[PDB]
Design a protein around this ligand. Structure first.
Ligand SMILES: [Ca+2]
Length: 556
């Protein structure tokens, strides 16, 4: 007791918190959406909300399949949630087989039902349904498997999730049933915004219970990561959430473990790990981030008739995410009895076999100077576009450069990011394809590093060239509009064994800014510059120089 480095405010957290290296090193986790919503097997965690909305397809489905809302409520699925085939060790063997490094079971979704040993919430999996501590058994299994344990909380939305049950006859109108939460209106605001309009989305009781909920998860299971759904960022909840963050980060100091909080918006990108959709951006993000997707094409939780995705598209996206400083949190949805389907076991096993061969380029890597090259919205056709071998993503680790082609070719590729205009004194020492015993034939040209693919595929899906090089490389510059000027961003990598001095020069509309940078041996860094007196960002004339060699000019 006594540890109080962190106070429940933003400036205190930012003063003392750093995103841990294990998260950056890990890259890949498995999300497991499993709960009472698995029983109807409709494929929606929002079953509990829409079943009470008169006329909604789920409402109509429920009334015919299970009965009127006054006789069969969401709570009445819970006795059926027996989980006769749940086995935590079996789950962890599937997770471990994927090559993932952490696991994120759902500790509590929006529906009010705790999947763990809760003291205040009598709607829990120890007392009801499975009659076991699902989260506790998964924590023990994860320790034995040698992975890191996280979990997700979606309880904040329980404050309003059952609001439609008050508008039509149903058991939600019996306000003594606490599973159904505060029955408030959903907060206003579209998408990821802290604005809530005239409905706060929480109240005093739900805020206090959120602290009881997160405190007991922290105290009982000491998770290394806690993921939260989107409404914890609405303005009225932020004081409560900062109290949670301080308690979690202070506890973690005592545990001698560094921890991660995920949120979708509302909090600084340095005091937590953003969990965000993948943009259209090719850019490397400065801070580590996470993005989530399901193995199922249709759903996250289990539904009959699910069509699962192919390992190829998942792996291609995974590599793209990793090249841009992201982690992939990939979801499986077990059946209500606790069985992970053969199809999803197979997808995870294929990813794991890919990582067995190619993981050197993934685990522990960091973004290079630039994440991607190659050709890769509103199309009024089905174009059937796929990646080609010329679509390349980059990572670096231990001064090695990994160039990952997202498809195969019988010919060659030319790595354009190693074109001579980006390079000073670059010499290639070796090139190999991970998993290949064949010697790679390659040649440096002015246009880049030409690399001939070997004869046999070591793996499907994506193919890694490991490149050992010396020299200094700069990325192509990025331009961002600032008032009366422009911000220029590059990354520089010194692959030499000795420190290097580099000069960058941005000449925009005749205004010249220069910076000299000492880049430590076998290291890389962001460099930002700013040109002034730019009348028009769209009409600007731009030249960028790397040690007085022209790297870029907006020629077209
Ligand atoms: Ca591919």
């Amino acid at each position: 007791k006594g540890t109080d480095v962190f106070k429940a405010d933003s400036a205190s957290i930012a003063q003392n918190y750093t995103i841990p290296e294990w998260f950056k090193d890990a890259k890949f986790g498995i999300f497991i959406h499993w709960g009472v919503y698995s029983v109807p097997a409709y494929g929606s965690e929002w079953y509990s909300r829409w079943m009470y909305k008169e006329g909604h397809p789920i409402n109509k489905y429920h009334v015919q399949t299970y009965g009127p809302l006054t006789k069969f409520g969401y709570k009445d699925f819970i006795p059926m949630f027996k989980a006769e085939n749940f086995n935590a060790d079996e789950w962890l063997a599937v997770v471990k087989s994927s090559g993932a490094q952490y696991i994120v079971p759902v500790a509590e979704h929006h529906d009010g039902f705790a999947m763990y040993s809760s003291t205040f919430n009598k709607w829990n999996a120890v007392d009801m349904g499975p009659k076991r501590d699902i989260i506790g058994e998964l924590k023990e299994a994860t320790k034995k498997a040698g992975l890191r344990f996280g979990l997700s909380s979606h309880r904040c939305e329980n404050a309003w999730f059952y609001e439609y049950g008050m508008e039509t006859p149903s058991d939600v109108q019996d306000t003594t049933i606490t599973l159904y939460g505060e029955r408030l209106h959903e907060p206003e605001g579209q998408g990821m915004t802290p604005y809530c309009g005239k409905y706060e989305g929480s109240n005093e009781r739900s805020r206090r219970q959120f602290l009881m909920h997160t405190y007991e998860l922290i105290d009982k299971y000491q998770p290394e990561l806690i993921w939260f759904d989107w409404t914890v960022g609405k303005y009225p909840f932020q004081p409560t959430f900062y109290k949670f963050m301080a308690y979690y980060y202070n506890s973690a100091l005592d545990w001698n473990k560094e921890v991660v909080v995920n949120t979708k918006f509302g909090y600084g990108d340095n005091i937590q790990v953003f969990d965000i959709e993948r943009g259209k951006s090719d850019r490397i993000r400065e801070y580590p981030w996470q993005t989530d997707t399901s193995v199922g094409k249709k759903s996250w939780s289990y539904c009959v008739g699910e069509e699962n995705k192919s390992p190829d598209h998942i792996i291609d996206d995974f590599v793209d995410i990793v090249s841009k400083n992201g982690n992939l949190l990939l979801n499986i949805g077990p059946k209500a009895d606790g069985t992970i389907t053969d199809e999803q076991k197979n997808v995870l096993a294929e990813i794991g076999k890919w990582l067995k061969t190619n993981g050197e380029a993934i685990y522990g890597s960091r973004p290079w100077v630039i994440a991607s090259e190659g050709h890769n919205g509103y199309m009024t056709d089905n174009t059937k576009t796929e990646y080609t071998a010329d679509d390349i993503r980059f990572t670096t680790c231990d001064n090695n450069l990994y160039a990952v082609s997202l498809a195969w070719t019988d010919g060659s590729v030319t790595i354009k990011s190693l074109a001579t205009k980006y390079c000073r004194n670059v010499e290639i020492e070796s090139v190999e394809m991970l998993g290949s015993s064949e010697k790679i034939d390659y040649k440096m040209t002015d246009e880049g590093l030409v690399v001939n693919f070997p004869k046999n595929k070591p793996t499907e899906y994506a193919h890694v060239f490991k490149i050992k090089l010396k020299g200094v490389v700069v990325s192509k510059p990025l331009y961002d509009k600032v008032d009366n000027g422009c911000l220029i961003t590059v990354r520089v990598a010194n692959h030499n064994a000795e420190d290097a001095n580099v000069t960058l020069k941005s000449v925009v509309d005749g205004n010249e800014v220069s910076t000299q940078v000492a880049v430590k041996a076998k290291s890389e860094q962001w460099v930002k510059m700013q040109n002034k007196d730019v009348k028009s960002f769209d009409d600007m004339s731009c030249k960028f120089y790397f040690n007085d060699n022209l790297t870029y000019e907006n020629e077209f």
